[PDB]
């Protein structure tokens with residue numbers, strides 16, 4: 066089997082991407098944030114504290130004839146940006162782009178943090194990292210991809226995120242018309258539960274490529290590109306007037322600037338992020354100071370190839386016995 070679904074930016078800045086997902090019988094369609102950096106499929110629901118729901122579409126398990134409460138199971142997640150959510154668990158039928166999994170764990174939120182409430186466009190998350198990170202207790206549950214994998218034509222999914230435009234998540238096949246050149250594959254460590262890999266280096270604009278190992282994670286659920294302080298300083302030094310602002314929380318730059326591209330290495334291959342992808346717009350409405358899309362990972366503990374990087378590529382998440390990651394230009 067295969068599936069294919071369009072993913073759409075939630076706003077004009079590509080702050081996140083939502084993909085429609087059918088849950089239950091009859092289907093309840095929710096727009097979920099597909100997140101290769103986590104492993105829980107959780108949704109706003111009829112059980113969510115009312116004051117914490119503000120415009121989201123909710124899953125109502127009592128209206129699904131295939132929903133079953135997973136007795137005694139709870140979940141609770143804290144994401145790296147400080148947001149969090151928790152609740153109980155159902156199993157139900159879940160379909161993405163024509164690919165159906167029966168008995169998928171659907172984690173129904175009883176509580177969500179303010180950042181989730183304040184984003185009316187995201188109805189929940191669909192985790193695509195390794196199932197070892199799933200938070201359901203006392204019996205850990207499998208991700209949608211892990212449940213589907215044996216039925217898929219090939220045990221893979223691909224992320225093709227658009228810049229200011231829709232894109233595609235495919236399951237079970239590689240669309241060879243969706244990229245240029247070849248896909249370069251690179252080794253993955255699953256020891257931390259992530260799609261963790263090592264980039265071979267970087268360049269800023271038309272500058273010389275610096276060969277250096279950068280260990281990080283491929284994370285569709287993180288907006289920005291978080292890299293070591295030395296790398297980030299080298300990038301922003303090429304933008305007149307850019308500076309790291311402790312009050313704002315990162316590098317900012319004059320909105321009138323033209324940003325240079327940023328290239329990252331995948332083996333001998335090179336993925337070029339156009340400068341415009343690095344502009345996240347005014348720091349507050351009406352400001353002429355803009356937020357940068359490349360930020361320091363200091364204090365995260367890991368480098369993160371978020372949407373800024375991934376949307377410059379066609380990305381293969383290969384879930385074979387030994388997982389690998391593939392990148393192509395597009």
Ligand SMILES: C[C@@H](N)COc1cc(Cl)cc(Cl)c1
Pocket residue numbers: 102103143144145146284286287291364365369
């Ligand atoms: C839950 C994880 N997928 C999130 O990963 C992180 C963690 C931190 Cl501390 C910061 C950022 Cl931007 C991302």
Ligand SMILES: C[C@H](N)COc1cc(Cl)cc(Cl)c1
Pocket residue numbers: 071072227230231232233
């Ligand atoms: C009707 C078209 N052939 C559809 O092609 C596209 C074009 C963009 Cl920009 C994004 C996506 Cl998801 C699909």
